[PDB]
């Protein structure tokens, strides 16, 4: 009895996984100035809209 | 003499566009169409 590994298939599947990972982790969304979600008081109308 | 052979194949083209499956960012295809309009005549109808 003996054991050996097929390198080509392993690396093909790993390459697919690598491309998937590259398409997810790398991206960065740049956003500077926004609305405020923390409200100190009760302001009625405008608070409800932006919270929604 | 006796014994013949039958092969089974798919078409291809010299010029083909590039598309993005989930796994591969670059895979070539025979013919494709864009889904985003990007050019305007500059006139109102």
């Amino acid at each position: 009895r003996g054991q050996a590994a097929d390198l080509k298939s392993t690396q093909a599947a790993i390459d697919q996984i690598n491309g998937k990972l590259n398409r997810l982790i790398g991206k960065t969304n740049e956003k500077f100035h926004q609305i405020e979600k923390e409200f100190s008081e009760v302001e009625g109308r405008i608070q409800d809209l932006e919270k929604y | 003499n006796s014994t013949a052979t039958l092969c089974l194949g798919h078409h291809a083209v010299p010029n083909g566009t590039i598309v993005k499956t989930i796994t591969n960012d670059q895979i070539e295809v025979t013919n494709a169409t864009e889904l985003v309009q990007s050019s305007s005549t500059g006139e109102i109808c």
């Epitope: 790993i14 790398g26 | 670059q26």
Partner: antibody, heavy 127, light 110 residues
Framework: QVQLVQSAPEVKRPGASVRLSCKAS????????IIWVRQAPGQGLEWMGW????????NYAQKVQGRVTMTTDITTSTAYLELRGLRSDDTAVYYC????????????????????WGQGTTVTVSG | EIVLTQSPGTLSLSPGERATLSCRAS???????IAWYQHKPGQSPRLLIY???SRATGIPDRFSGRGSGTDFTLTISRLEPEDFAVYYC??????????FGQGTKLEIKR
């Protein structure tokens, strides 16, 4: 430490074929690929091709697709670049940097970049 | 292909000043690729910044990399005599392919 030792300077006649050697020490050879990039006189670095130690797969530059053949040898961690049909423009300094990790999934971008570089071999082709 | 254009091609700056080197991408690329390399005359090229902002081992912390999408920049502070060289910028295609940069020359001192 991780180290890459290239071949010797060469002089060739136009139309001949040249073979270049790159040897790896320290790191496990089969895990990373070997990537060849050249610098022509007064020119920026120019990618040529990539060979894998895990797989036999090769990718070549469009300008040198026909004329370039790249091989790998596990014993002992030696990568060979053969350029045929040499032309005057091929006079350059050829480097062999370490390439992508062909053994496992990749999250650090360190393996997706060329890190350890050889000294380089100068090939001058003229009649 | 993804052609890369390097801004200013030659930069002159006295020792001890911050320097900014620009690499402009023809198409948008993830920050995962687009690493930054150093070439010293008569010496093998060296890796300074891998990925986008990560610092390679043994690289002085004065070197910093940054950027997104089309625009990527390399910033050097407290410029010392070791730093003067040519700098290159590169990325990767899914089928292994590595387009490099034209070359920014840091010929400096006044």
């Amino acid at each position: 430490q991780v180290q890459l030792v290239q071949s010797a300077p060469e002089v060739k006649r136009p139309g001949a074929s040249v073979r270049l050697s790159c040897k790896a020490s320290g790191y496990t050879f089969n895990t990373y690929g070997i990537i060849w990039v050249r610098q022509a006189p007064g020119q920026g670095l120019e990618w040529m091709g990539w060979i894998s130690a895990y797989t036999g797969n090769t990718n070549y530059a469009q300008k040198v697709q026909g004329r370039v053949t790249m091989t790998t040898d596990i014993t002992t961690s030696t990568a060979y670049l053969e350029l045929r049909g040499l032309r005057s423009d091929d006079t350059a300094v050829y480097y062999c940097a370490r390439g992508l990790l062909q053994g496992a999934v990749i999250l650090d971008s360190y393996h997706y970049a060329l890190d350890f570089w050889g000294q380089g071999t100068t090939v001058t082709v003229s009649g | 292909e993804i052609v890369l254009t390097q801004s200013p091609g030659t930069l002159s700056l006295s020792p001890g000043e911050r320097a900014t080197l620009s690499c402009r991408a023809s198409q948008s690329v993830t920050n995962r690729f687009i690493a930054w390399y150093q070439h010293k005359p008569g010496q093998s090229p060296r890796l300074l910044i891998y990925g986008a902002s990560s610092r390679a081992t043994g690289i002085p912390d004065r070197f910093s990399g940054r950027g997104s999408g089309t625009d990527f920049t390399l910033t050097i502070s407290r410029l010392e005599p070791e730093d003067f060289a040519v700098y290159y910028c590169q990325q990767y295609d899914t089928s292994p392919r590595w387009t490099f940069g034209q070359g920014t020359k840091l010929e400096i001192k006044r």
